[PDB]
Amino acid sequence: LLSLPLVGSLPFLPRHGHMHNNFFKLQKKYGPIYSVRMGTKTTVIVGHHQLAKEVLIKKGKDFSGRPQMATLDIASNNRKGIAFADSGAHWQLHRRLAMATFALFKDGDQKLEKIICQEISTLCDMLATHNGQSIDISFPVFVAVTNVISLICFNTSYKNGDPELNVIQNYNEGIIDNLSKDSLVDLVPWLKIFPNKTLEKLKSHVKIRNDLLNKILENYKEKFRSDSITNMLDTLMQAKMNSDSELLSDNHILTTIGDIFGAGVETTTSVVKWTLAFLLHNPQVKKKLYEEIDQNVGFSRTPTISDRNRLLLLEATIREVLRLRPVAPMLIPHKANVDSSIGEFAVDKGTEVIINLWALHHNEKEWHQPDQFMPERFLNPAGTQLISPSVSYLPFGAGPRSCIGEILARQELFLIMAWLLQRFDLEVPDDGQLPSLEGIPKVVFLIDSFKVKIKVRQAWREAQ
Ligand code: HEM
Ligand SMILES: C[C@]12CC[C@H](O)CC1=CC[C@@H]1[C@@H]2CC[C@]2(C)C(c3cccnc3)=CC[C@@H]12
Numbered sequence: 001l002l003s004l005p006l007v008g009s010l011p012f013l014p015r016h017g018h019m020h021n022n023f024f025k026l027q028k029k030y031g032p033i034y035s036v037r038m039g040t041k042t043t044v045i046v047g048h049h050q051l052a053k054e055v056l057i058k059k060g061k062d063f064s065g066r067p068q069m070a071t072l073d074i075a076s077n078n079r080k081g082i083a084f085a086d087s088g089a090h091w092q093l094h095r096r097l098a099m100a101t102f103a104l105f106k107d108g109d110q111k112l113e114k115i116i117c118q119e120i121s122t123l124c125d126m127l128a129t130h131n132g133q134s135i136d137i138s139f140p141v142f143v144a145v146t147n148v149i150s151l152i153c154f155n156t157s158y159k160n161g162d163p164e165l166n167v168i169q170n171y172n173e174g175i176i177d178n179l180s181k182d183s184l185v186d187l188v189p190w191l192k193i194f195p196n197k198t199l200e201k202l203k204s205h206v207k208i209r210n211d212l213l214n215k216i217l218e219n220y221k222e223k224f225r226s227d228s229i230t231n232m233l234d235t236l237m238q239a240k241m242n243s244d245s246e247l248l249s250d251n252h253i254l255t256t257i258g259d260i261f262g263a264g265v266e267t268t269t270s271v272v273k274w275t276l277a278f279l280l281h282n283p284q285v286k287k288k289l290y291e292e293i294d295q296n297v298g299f300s301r302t303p304t305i306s307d308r309n310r311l312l313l314l315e316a317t318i319r320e321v322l323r324l325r326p327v328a329p330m331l332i333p334h335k336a337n338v339d340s341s342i343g344e345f346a347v348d349k350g351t352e353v354i355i356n357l358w359a360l361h362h363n364e365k366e367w368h369q370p371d372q373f374m375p376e377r378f379l380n381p382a383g384t385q386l387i388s389p390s391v392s393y394l395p396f397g398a399g400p401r402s403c404i405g406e407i408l409a410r411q412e413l414f415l416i417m418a419w420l421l422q423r424f425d426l427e428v429p430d431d432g433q434l435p436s437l438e439g440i441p442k443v444v445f446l447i448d449s450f451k452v453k454i455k456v457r458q459a460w461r462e463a464q
Helices: 019-030 049-058 070-075 089-103 112-129 138-154 164-179 198-218 232-242 250-281 283-297 305-309 312-324 357-362 406-423
Strands: 033-038 041-046 133-135 340-342 345-347 352-355 424-427 452-456
Touching (some): 049 340, 049 352, 070 198, 089 232, 112 406, 112 424, 138 406, 164 198, 250 424, 283 406, 305 406
Antiparallel strands (some): 033 041, 133 452, 340 345
């Protein structure tokens, strides 16, 4: 007898399990580096911190490109902005500008901390009215960080109950929904194979986004002045003026701002939401954080960046969430700019390269009990200093494409968690429903919405 002719082979079921996991699973069989073919396209998947550090750092510029996806083409207005922009003059300029923007927030009245704290203050005030009730805290958090990013981008914020916030939250939900089904690593190009409305759907969420950004950018051309660089939009216009003409067109500026707005809001919200979930499943850790927040900060004042030097277990909890649930479990896809190599294997010009960050954060030789939420992994055995327990760890990636929002995100997470932990007891709702920790892989790695019982703290009031 005979083997049947094979016309197609995939090593696991599509739309079965999370893909970053299925890829990790195959490491057992094939090693930490291997490739897949779909039509003309080859894709490399990397699942070890050494070979990843080759792609991200050592050969940074070689692998700093982005592949082209019909779905990203829409989200990025034909490859503009930073995130889904390919390497080139376009990317490099807009990346450096945005970065330069961030320094305009290093010291003074527009200290990043002061902008962050104002909003956490509104945010804690709103949340306080719900004393005794179980709420989904998604929207209150989305609001506070929508504000921080808005101030940083434009020097504007939204008053309470402005409907624009609701309009944003909507096309954000609908873009994240139609950007991919599961991860950005779509394996089989299902949307070229059968009739469907997903590009149609995606276009018209992005239309409404682009329309809101167009209003603000034409309504700002007349407020703009050379002697006043205080936000990101200024920085961009300060560049268009001096000069790079092809590079800073209207579309190009809109899209960069659109990336930062998107990225500022959805990543931090998601992580806050994860952190709260892990905290609800871990009442032993939760208790110690209240005890640590009392011993070190008490109730004479609200928490402060300078507190990162003493709220160590809080910073370890955040570190551990960013490990167990990476925001980007497979980063964003890379691409080979020139012919090159990983681990001394050939990788040709144009090949998609994916770092399975999830594998690195779960490597069993690198972590002692990787499947466990254990903020202790990030402390010395006593409890008094933060440690880097493995090199297989890159929540913010690294190299030419590393996260630019990293200082922003770090401070937003630490300050949100600290104000929250000071003022509020956060408990399971009366119906003992805990959130699912499984997650929902999309551009960002999300958690199903859930509810938290929020109460005002006995110790917080017993001091007013
Ligand atoms: C916990 C929150 C965050 C995490 C864990 C995180 C992590 C990451 C990772 C892993 C990447 C991709 C690295 C790669 O593609 O190889 C990335 C890229 C990026 N992030 Fe974040 N990030 C966070 C928050 C933010 C924030 C607050 C912003 C905006 C202020 C932001 C803006 C960006 C942008 C614009 C890129 C694209 C970089 C490029 O293509 O050159 N991120 N981030
Ligand atoms: C789709 C979305 C989120 C929904 C918005 O409507 C549009 C948008 C634009 C830029 C994207 C963002 C999600 C987060 C992205 C993908 C991001 C990012 C992703 C992960 C970590 N850090 C940053 C850089 C650009 C960001």
